[PDB]
RNA sequence: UUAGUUGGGCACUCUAAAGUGACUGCCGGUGCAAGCCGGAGGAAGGUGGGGAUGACGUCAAAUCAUCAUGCCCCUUAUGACCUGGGCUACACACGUGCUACAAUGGAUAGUACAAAGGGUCGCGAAGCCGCGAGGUGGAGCUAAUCCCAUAAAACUAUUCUCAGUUCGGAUUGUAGGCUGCAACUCGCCUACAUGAAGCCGGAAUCGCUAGUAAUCGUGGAUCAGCAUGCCACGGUGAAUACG
RNA sequence: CGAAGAACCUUACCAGGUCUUGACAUCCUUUGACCACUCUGGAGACAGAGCUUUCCCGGGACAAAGUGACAGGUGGUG
């Protein structure tokens, strides 16, 4: 009855590690769900691409989240050890 | 303030304009304040306001209360072309 | 329950027929409560008649997205699809009368320095 | 009519708007003290009914003192000699607004070229 | 001009109203993002070194 | 294109989309319904072979093409699309249908296209000046 | 159950990772060939649609005011602080746009269907007071949970009956509300009243080939507040291309 | 169009009132918490006083005053 959301800007990165979460929860505690996907919230920043002038001619950068929830169906201290020991590759969060 | 939470006045206008119920009228008091409103406590006394290079006297009247004070003294003279 | 799913621009129908008399829900709604036109509900239509099974099957359906005639759209798709689903057979009437073609005209980009999609300002020389 | 001669043939509302110092909202106010019908025509009035209405805008402000009042002020701030008041002695914007360009129905119509 | 303007952005002013941002690598006010704290143009340049995270260029 | 849902033809489908304004097709689609329903009313008879005779009445045949010939730009006639034929059609009826000045639109259409089935009204008029200003210029040809 | 509510289940959507597929790959015609035209299947057919992606160099094009930067100049002032003012001026000209000039419409009521987005000292609910702008309140929310957020055009009914009009909405007067220490110069919004010009635009001139043009609303940034501007969003949805 | 927000600030311009190792950095010398809050004269900057500045383990980090080297220029030339 306890929860894991993990939310980044790399896909395969979160994947990885959402796969490497599940797979230790496993081992931990056979009873688990598998990493569900939410949408990708996003930014757009448009910008002038040049200096002075020029508000016609502009280039756009977008800032994308990835993102994956787990849920835990059944503990063990064994569980809570495994993922209170885990660093995970940073660049992402993880939220529990 | 257009609001009932009002009205506003500058402290540093309103304590001199105070003490300007004994001042008789023959002397004159200079502000750099055009954002503050004329009270009824302003007539009389005439006031030299600040309009961006030189102090301007206005005569306060009671149809001159509730407007404020760079109304009566304004910032950029034109002459017609 | 024979089924099926149809797209047009943002809106998706989630379509299901059952043998009837011709009856037909949209959201829990009358067809006519919902689309009044006379136009967009002979396109309803449009697979029905192009294979004659109007006077058979019940028409069950629910709606997300786009507007109503986008909706439309989507439900002829999904019921020309879930026609497919009973019968094979329908697949040559229903591709020539080309209710399967997903309509892929979905809505342009906007783009900088234009007003909309396509349009530029007005030029001026001087 | 009523304070003058309204159309006979518009409606009760609209003849009421064409009396300065009243529109449409002030109209159905007026003809909900009055408990009358006001999508019914004004030919077909009736004159108890009629006098009954000129006593509600006797009530209400007189056309011609509205139109002193609104002189009165104006006046007052020419005469004081106020920012706003030169505005309105000028023939220019009182709002806060731009004359650069965009300034006809102060102006006036397009003057003579430079 | 810009270097007093710098300082006299970072003390606190008499009244809060008085605050404006400011890109603390050059200092211009205009069209600076309150998200990255950046100027439009430093943050195009860094945007494209990727040294901000996440952000690449939007095709869409 | 497509026909019309309720009367088989592409006709109806074009001059509703050719009265449209804005996208407003459900507007014009029912008030070209309507003014069927007025012509059957003061008719009686086939709203689509009064609305073919009126097509067949409005329908030029001989259309002018500005041509630089000798110096100059000059008049040349020639026979018209059968496609432009039916456009052009189209699209004097539904301006003339505007520019009229009676009440309601769908009035403005049955009118016209009754006086276009019985050969007159403006849309005749025109047909017959575009042939007059054509066989005028017809030496060029 | 008032509510997809609660239970239950991922069927279907939706989400988003890895795959598939569309490659002239196949058939007919012609070409010697490259290729071209047609045909089939399939969702999609001919670089499917749209983007980003901009070669050597031209205009000594713009930028010393984003930044850095050589040279020169000021260096008890060409530097620095504070208040107040100006960048919003106004006889007039141009560009770009918003609003309209109305009956394919306006006023009033009821009422269906969107997408893409933002939110922590931020979104701010329900309920209430207020004609209204808003006030109060504090639920829920660090968010596919909750909010901003009635989407509006559409449709249905009633009215206005083609009129400078219930068009149009300026300008002005009075009174309100917010924001902010402060709204005169110089913000926005509301109520009442006023009701301007305008009854489809000279010579000329501009965008657009498809979900485009036109049209309707929405969101975001910047931002205390201040948009007809900018960038994205979906809704409706055409005409035409002889050449 | 720079301006993806000109009420003050922004803002570079103007008038007025003021300062000159300075609004902003390094190097030296003395010292160490520097300051914060109230009162008065002020348009405010700023001056007079008060209360009150706890630096931490010779070192570290930031600070007041002297002191010249230097600073600073949205001053110029795209
Ligand atoms: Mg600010
Ligand atoms: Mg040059
Ligand atoms: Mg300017
Ligand atoms: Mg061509
Ligand atoms: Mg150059
Ligand atoms: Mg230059
Ligand atoms: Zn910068």
Redesign the interface.
């Known amino acids: 009855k306890i929860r894991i959301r993990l939310k980044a800007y790399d896909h395969r990165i979160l994947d990885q590690s959402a796969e490497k979460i599940v797979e230790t929860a496993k081992r931990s505690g056979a009873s688990v769900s598998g990493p569900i996907p939410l949408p990708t919230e996003k930014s757009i920043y448009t910008v002038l691409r040049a200096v002075h002038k020029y508000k016609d001619s502009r280039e756009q950068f977008e800032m994308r989240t990835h993102k994956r929830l787990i849920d835990i169906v059944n503990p063990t201290p064994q569980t809570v050890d495994s993922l209170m020991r885990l660093d995970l590759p940073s660049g992402v969060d993880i939220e529990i | 303030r257009s609001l009932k939470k009002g009205p506003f006045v500058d402290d540093h206008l309103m304590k001199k304009v105070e003490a300007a119920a004994e001042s008789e009228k023959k002397q004159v008091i200079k502000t750099w304040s055009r954002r503050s409103t004329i009270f009824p406590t302003f007539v009389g006394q005439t006031i030299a306001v600040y309009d961006g290079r030189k102090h301007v006297p206005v005569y306060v009247?009671e149809?001159?209360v509730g407007?404020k004070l760079?109304?009566?003294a304004?910032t950029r003279t034109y002459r017609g072309? | 329950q024979y089924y099926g799913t149809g797209r047009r621009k943002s809106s998706v129908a989630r379509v299901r027929l059952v043998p009837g008399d011709g009856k037909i829900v949209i959201n829990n709604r009358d067809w006519e409560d919902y689309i009044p036109f006379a136009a967009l509900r002979e396109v309803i239509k449009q697979p029905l008649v192009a294979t004659e099974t109007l006077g058979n099957y019940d028409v069950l359906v629910n709606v997300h997205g786009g507007g109503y005639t986008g909706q439309a759209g989507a439900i002829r798709h999904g019921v020309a699809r879930a026609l497919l689903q009973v019968a094979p057979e329908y697949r040559p009437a229903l591709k020539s009368a080309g209710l399967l073609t997903r309509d892929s005209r979905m809505k342009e980009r906007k783009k900088p320095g234009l007003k909309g999609a396509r349009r530029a300002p007005q030029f001026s020389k001087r | 009519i009523a304070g003058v001669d309204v159309p006979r043939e518009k409606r009760i509302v609209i003849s009421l708007t064409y009396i300065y110092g009243i529109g449409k909202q002030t109209a159905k106010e007026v003809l909900a003290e009055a408990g009358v019908s006001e999508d019914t025509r004004t030919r077909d009035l009736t004159e108890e009914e009629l006098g009954k209405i000129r006593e509600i805008l006797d009530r209400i402000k007189v056309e011609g003192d509205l139109r002193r009042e609104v002189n009165l002020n104006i006046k007052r701030l020419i005469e004081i000699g106020s920012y706003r008041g030169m505005r309105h002695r000028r023939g220019l914007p009182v709002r806060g607004q731009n004359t650069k360009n965009n300034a006809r129905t102060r102006k006036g119509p397009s003057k003579t070229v430079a | 001009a810009k270097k007093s303007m710098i300082a006299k952005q970072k003390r606190t002013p008499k009244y809060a109203v008085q605050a404006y941002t400011r890109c603390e690598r050059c200092g211009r006010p205009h069209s600076v993002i309150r998200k990255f704290k950046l100027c439009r143009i430093c943050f195009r340049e860094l945007a494209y070194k990727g040294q901000i995270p996440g952000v690449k260029k939007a095709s869409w | 294109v497509l026909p019309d849902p309720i009367y088989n033809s592409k006709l109806v489908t074009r001059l509703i989309n050719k009265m449209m304004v804005d996208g407003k097709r459900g507007k014009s689609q029912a008030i070209l319904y309507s003014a069927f329903d007025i012509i059957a009313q003061e008719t009686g008879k086939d709203p689509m072979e009064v609305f073919e005779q009126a097509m067949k009445n409005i329908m030029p045949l001989l259309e002018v093409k500005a041509r630089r010939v000798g110096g100059a730009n000059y008049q040349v006639p020639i026979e018209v699309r059968a496609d432009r034929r039916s456009t052009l059609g189209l699209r004097w009826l539904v301006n003339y249908a505007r520019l009229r000045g009676e009440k309601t639109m769908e009035v403005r259409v049955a009118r016209e296209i009754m006086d276009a089935a019985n050969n007159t009204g403006a849309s005749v008029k025109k047909r017959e000046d575009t042939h007059k200003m054509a066989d005028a210029n017809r030496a060029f040809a």
């Open positions: 009247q149809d001159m407007h760079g109304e009566f304004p072309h």
